[PDB]
Design a protein around this nucleic acid. Structure first.
Lengths: 69, 241, 95, 92, 69, 391, 100, 164
DNA sequence: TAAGTCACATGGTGCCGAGGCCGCTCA
DNA sequence: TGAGCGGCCTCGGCACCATGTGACTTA
């Protein structure tokens, strides 16, 4: 379950339980934030995921389905 | 701030006789003044039977405020259906004694005067035309303010006012042309053309001339100590049948 | 009271610095217009840009801002650098 | 608190005196006289602690308010209802 | 709030019929003090010309009154 | 350290809190009690499930709200309510009674002059605002989202310092300052207050929103309007903004359908029923007119003042009631600027004007756009036929 | 600054406030011997000079401790409003890794 | 901090109570009894309006005014002497990276901030300048690579269109 | 001496938060 | 029968323009 604002720019959603919230400009993600912290989850891998998740929206969908498996 | 209450009179009563009875009853001499004014001096306002009789009864004791300066002004014309009205300022309790004596002595029927919307517009027209000692009429321009209190459901619109500055009023009058009734001929048609409001139909409670007078539906209050002849005449044509 | 005195002193120092920076920028822009590009070294094809920009103030950047939406245009955007540090092609090719 | 009076108590106490004799009190003056009522009560209790017959009228003569008992039950006339001033007259 | 209420205030400050009369006379004297002080306040305000009175006016008036008492 | 946490207890009058909780219904009191005891706890001893069962026994006992108010003010928290409680009850009063609050809009201009569409990271915004206002005053800020509207309403409460007054050790509260943040809109609604603390709160809010380029709040209106739903309809990020009065048909789009729709039901094929309007001056000249054309002129006034034939749905009530508007119409009659200042007052200006138009007191063929409710709740000067608002 | 403390101490010393003439004039009740009064005044001068020096020592220690503690507070405030270069270098290294 | 209570408490503990107790004890132990009582009487007599709490309060307020003047002086000295690059001269993402990340990692804001990075022992300054120049080269390579990748993507788009 | 400019001090209209009683009102 | 919300409404404090008169100057 996700929450959309009026222009669908400031969003937040859960992939499995990780709260990934995004600031997205015109058809391109310019900012990302991984919020939920698991004891197995680290911070450098979190930063690498945040850098990797940037880019286009179709690319975000493809890479998120890739990293989900 | 001298409020004038207006009362009509059913008969043409002559005040130069019998006023000694009022002097004896009130134990004081009143300063009755007799004048014969001719108000519609303009050719388009009538050229015959224009003469009025103006009585200025005054309970003169001292001159500090209206507590000792409750004036009485009477106007009359014998060539009308209703021949006389009075208007009195101040708040002295002797004024109703004067009215009771006037009734019980002359046998007149007296009723309060209420002004309609067009009557109030004509009174605002009358209260700017000033007569000069050189026998000329001068229109002194005042920044008017039409003030309405409509009654709508759920009290949706309690009140609304239309403020008209002085230079805009004279600009409207000069745009219409050389006329001697500026509000009824230039200001009110301009308001109707612009905002769509027919102010002769809307509930108009007062029109306020800044610094001179603010007439209401039942009273006229004036900064000036007296009331000019045009206002008295327009009130006299107001109560005709 | 002493803490708020320190806060006011810091804010007044910032205000004086900002006003000085604004006046310095205004005088520096005037001096840069007067001493750099209005001289004889100005390229003659920029003589018309100067005319509408400072000579009498249309056909300039308004025309391009109209055309970049009329034509959906891009150009080769400049490589953003600072402090006259020019781009090193060997460094970025090694990068 | 418990010993100081309230502002509305002073309105109800002296509102008619400021109305017959034209007095205009802003809120600062109201708070000032609310403060002053305590000082007046302390001064009155310091001057008169216990109450018996002769000492109160002697003190009120010393107060500069009155000159005799006639002034006492004339000042009580303008400050009390009719039953209370009649009772005071029976007391004096 | 009657004068008897101020007498109730005075008796609860100090805590039969003759003492009630004594306290009623005390309340009358208190009202006399307040009326005299307010009269002096208006006198000084009219001397300075102000329509209303102010705390410094009535403070000076009551200091002059307590100087004589 | 001067920031105020969510566990400090201030000195609040017990009777004011007593009459404050009287207005709330029983179910929000129930939800508040369980949430408060789950988060902070209370002086009452018991398990969270045990207290849930106790409140359950209270609600199938059908007890009045007065008894549970005395309970939560005398045994649950007898020492005093925490600041979070005092903020959350007042926010719940705002939710329950939105018509008792007036708001003032302010655009979030920035830099060159283009409006800044404000976006909030709520927890970080609250933390940054509290740290910014902690340097000046003892500040506690509480933020929540409206159950119905897409806003983010904050509540900023400021605390001051403190015959012999004995001892209180208090922190006296002031009236709280509310600033409402719509999701994506430059317009910012704030509570009606012009003292130095309101200016401080708005200034700190402008300094803590920005973080990239300096932002100033410019007030777009000086007349407050009630009922936060109405100010989102007027100034919020909705279609009804900049389409009001006779142009609400465009904001509601009830007149055209999709181009993918049935073309037998198109407006141009079925047609619409109208009347010939007389352009000659005949309104001032004139009884028991035909009830079909009377319905048509009523529909004409309804269309002029509300945009729709049936309206946005007694029947004179507009989409947003307006309290005060003042228009200054200026014309040029032969090189003379002629100004007319029309001021209005009431509970619904344009509904009352619609009622006056229905009573044949105002000509509906000559009532202008700005009088009809176009650019509603904005007061300004009409020069050259164009309405520019005041500042 | 410390001159005010020195004046406050010296203005309330028995020898500075009471002279030997006033000492003998007051103490005529018990002994009229001038030698014993002189010896007692010498003991008074010795003891009040000693405690004057000791009060001066403690007020100097108090002033230095107060100034040092409040100066460390000022230094901590200035460091809080300032930025060390090494943390900036570490942040730039992290940013360099991100850009890499 | 609380300097004023420390000053006032130090005065009222070590300055007046200690003085009174020490004077009483030393006058008692100087020998004798009547001598001490009498001398205490006149030294109390002439110290009137000098040991009162108003005098200690005024002394504490005056020494506080002197110390506050010294605070203004050393505050100007400590604010005019800066050691490194201060705040508000660098971007917000840099400032957030300095004191704990806010989880908002954005490439574009980082590029915009380190493009505005200021430039200046000697080895630390040289390392900072080298790192800043390296980051400027990183930004330049990033924009060049992005524009190049867009061009190659357009070429591959046309090639795949022809192939399909 | 008639008319004009001036600040000045009081008059007054509009506005609003606080709070009280009313006015049904419903269980 | 009894608690209870909502329009009313007035108190009064504030805000602002409006206003009449003495002091002073001009002719």
């Amino acid at each position: 379950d996700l929450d959309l604002d009026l222009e669908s720019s400031m969003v937040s959603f859960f992939v499995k339980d990780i709260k990934v919230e995004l600031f997205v400009k015109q058809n391109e993600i310019v900012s990302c934030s991984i919020l939920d912290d698991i004891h197995d989850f680290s911070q450098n891998n979190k930063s690498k995921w945040e850098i990797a998740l940037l880019g286009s929206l179709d690319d975000l969908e493809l890479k998120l389905n890739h990293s989900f498996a | 701030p001298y409020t004038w209450k207006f009362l009509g009179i059913s008969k043409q009563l002559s005040l130069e006789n019998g006023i000694a009875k009022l002097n004896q009853l009130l134990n004081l001499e009143v300063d009755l003044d007799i004048q014969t004014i001719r108000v519609p001096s303009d050719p388009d306002g009538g050229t015959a039977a224009d003469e009025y009789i103006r009585y200025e009864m005054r309970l003169d004791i001292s001159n500090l405020d209206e507590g000792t300066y409750s004036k009485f002004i009477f106007l009359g014309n014998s060539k009308m259906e209703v021949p006389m009205f009075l208007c009195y300022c101040g708040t002295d309790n002797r004024n109703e004694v004067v009215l009771q004596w006037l009734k019980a002595e002359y046998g007149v029927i007296m009723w309060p005067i209420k002004f309609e919307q067009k009557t109030m517009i004509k009174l605002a027209d009358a209260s700017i035309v000033h007569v000069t000692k050189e026998n000329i009429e001068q229109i002194t321009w005042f920044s008017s303010k039409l003030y309405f209190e409509p009654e709508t459901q759920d009290k949706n619109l309690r009140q609304f006012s239309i403020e008209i500055p002085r230079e805009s009023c004279e600009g409207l009058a000069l745009g219409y042309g050389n006329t001697m009734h500026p509000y009824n001929d230039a200001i009110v048609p301009y308001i109707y053309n612009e905002t769509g409001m027919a102010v002769e139909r809307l509930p108009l409670t007062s029109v306020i001339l800044a610094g001179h007078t603010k007439i209401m539906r039942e009273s006229i209050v004036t900064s000036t100590r007296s009331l000019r002849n045009r206002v008295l005449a327009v009130v006299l044509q107001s109560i005709q049948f | 009271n002493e803490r708020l005195e320190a806060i006011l002193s810091r804010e007044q120092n910032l205000l004086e610095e900002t006003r000085k920076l604004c006046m310095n920028l205004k005088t520096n822009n005037k001096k840069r217009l007067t001493e750099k590009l209005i001289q004889k070294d100005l390229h003659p094809v920029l003589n018309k840009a100067m005319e509408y920009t400072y000579g009498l103030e249309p056909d300039g950047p308004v025309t391009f801002r109209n055309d970049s939406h009329e034509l959906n245009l891009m150009l080769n955007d400049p490589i953003k650098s600072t402090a006259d540090v020019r781009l090193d092609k060997e460094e970025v090719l090694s990068l | 608190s418990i010993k100081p009076l309230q502002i509305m108590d002073l309105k109800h106490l002296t509102r008619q005196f400021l109305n017959e004799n034209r007095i205009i009190l802003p809120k600062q003056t109201w708070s000032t006289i609310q403060e002053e009522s305590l000082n007046i009560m302390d001064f009155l209790k310091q001057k008169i602690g216990t109450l018996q017959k002769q000492e109160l009228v002697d003190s009120f003569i010393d107060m500069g308010i009155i000159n005799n008992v006639d002034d006492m039950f004339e000042l009580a006339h303008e400050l009390l209802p009719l039953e209370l001033q009649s009772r005071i007259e029976s007391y004096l | 709030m009657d004068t008897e209420a101020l007498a109730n205030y005075l008796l609860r400050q100090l805590s039969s019929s003759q003492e009630y009369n004594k306290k009623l006379l005390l309340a009358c004297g208190f009202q006399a003090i307040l009326r005299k002080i307010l009269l002096d306040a208006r006198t000084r305000a009219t001397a300075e010309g102000l329509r209303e009175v102010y705390p410094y006016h009535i403070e000076a008036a009551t200091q002059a009154f307590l100087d004589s008492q | 350290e001067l920031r105020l946490e969510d566990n400090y207890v201030p000195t609040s009058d017990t009777l004011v809190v007593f009459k404050q909780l009287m207005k709330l219904p029983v179910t929000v009191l129930y939800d508040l009690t369980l949430s408060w005891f789950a988060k902070f706890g209370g002086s009452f001893d018991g398990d969270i499930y045990l207290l849930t069962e106790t409140l359950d026994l209270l609600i199938e006992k059908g007890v009045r709200r007065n008894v549970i108010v005395n309970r939560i003010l005398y045994v649950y928290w007898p020492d005093g309510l925490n600041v979070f409680q005092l903020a959350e009850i007042d926010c719940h009063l705002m939710i329950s009674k939105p018509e008792k609050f007036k708001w003032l809009p302010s655009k979030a201009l920035r830099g060159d002059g283009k409006p800044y569409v404000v976006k909030l990271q709520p927890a970080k915004f609250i933390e940054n605002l509290q740290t910014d206002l902690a340097k000046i005053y003892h500040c506690h800020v509480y933020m929540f989202k409206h159950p119905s509207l897409p806003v983010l309403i904050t509540r900023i409460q400021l605390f001051d310092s403190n015959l012999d007054k004995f001892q209180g050790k208090p922190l006296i509260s002031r009236r709280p300052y509310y600033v409402a943040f719509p999701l994506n809109s430059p317009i910012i609604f704030h509570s009606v207050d012009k003292d130095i603390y309101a200016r401080l709160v708005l200034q700190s809010i402008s300094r803590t929103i920005s973080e990239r380029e300096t932002i100033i709040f410019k007030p777009v209106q000086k007349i407050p309007v009630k009922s936060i739903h109405n100010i989102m309809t007027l100034l919020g990020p909705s279609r009804f903004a900049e389409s009001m009065g006779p142009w609400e048909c465009y904001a509601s789009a009830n007149f055209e359908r999709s181009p993918l729709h049935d073309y037998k039901k198109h407006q141009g094929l079925t047609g619409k029923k109208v009347m010939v309007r007389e352009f000659d001056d005949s309104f001032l000249n004139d009884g028991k007119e035909e009830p079909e054309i009377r319905r048509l002129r009523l529909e004409k006034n309804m269309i002029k003042f509300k945009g729709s034939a049936n309206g946005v749905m007694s029947r004179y009530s507009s989409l947003v009631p307006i309290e005060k508007v003042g228009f200054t119409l200026k014309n040029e009659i032969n090189s003379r600027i002629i100004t007319i200042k029309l001021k209005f007052n009431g509970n619904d200006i344009f509904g009352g004007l619609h009622e006056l138009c229905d009573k044949n007191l105002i000509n509906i063929d000559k009532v202008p756009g700005w009088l009809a409710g176009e650019n509603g709740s904005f007061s300004g000067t009409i020069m050259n036929g164009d309405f520019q608002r005041e500042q | 600054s410390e001159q005010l403390l020195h004046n406050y101490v010296s203005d309330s010393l028995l020898t500075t406030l009471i002279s030997f003439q006033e000492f003998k004039q007051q103490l005529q009740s018990y002994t009229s011997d001038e030698q014993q009064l002189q010896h007692w005044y010498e003991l008074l001068q010795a003891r009040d000079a000693r405690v004057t020096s000791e009060l001066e020592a403690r007020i100097k220690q108090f002033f230095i401790t107060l100034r040092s503690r409040l100066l460390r507070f000022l230094e901590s405030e200035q460091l809080s409003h300032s930025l060390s270069l090494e943390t900036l270098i570490d942040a730039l290294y992290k940013i360099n890794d991100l850009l890499q | 901090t609380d300097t004023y209570n420390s000053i006032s408490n130090f005065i009222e503990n070590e300055l007046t109570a200690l003085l009174s107790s020490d004077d009483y004890l030393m006058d008692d132990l100087a020998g004798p009894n009547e001598v001490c009582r009498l001398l205490k009487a006149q030294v109390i007599e002439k110290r009137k309006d000098a040991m009162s709490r108003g005098k200690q309060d005024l002394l504490s307020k005056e020494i506080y005014d002197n110390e506050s003047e010294l605070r203004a002086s050393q505050s100007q000295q400590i604010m005019e002497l800066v050691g490194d690059i201060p705040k508000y001269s660098l971007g917000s993402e840099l400032r957030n990276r300095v004191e704990g990340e806010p989880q908002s990692t954005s490439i574009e804001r980082l590029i915009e901030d380190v493009l505005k990075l200021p430039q200046m022992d000697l080895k630390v300054l040289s390392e900072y300048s080298n790192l800043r120049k390296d980051l400027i080269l990183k930004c330049q390579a990033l924009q060049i690579g992005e524009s190049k990748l867009s061009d190659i993507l357009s070429q591959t788009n046309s090639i795949n269109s022809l192939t399909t």
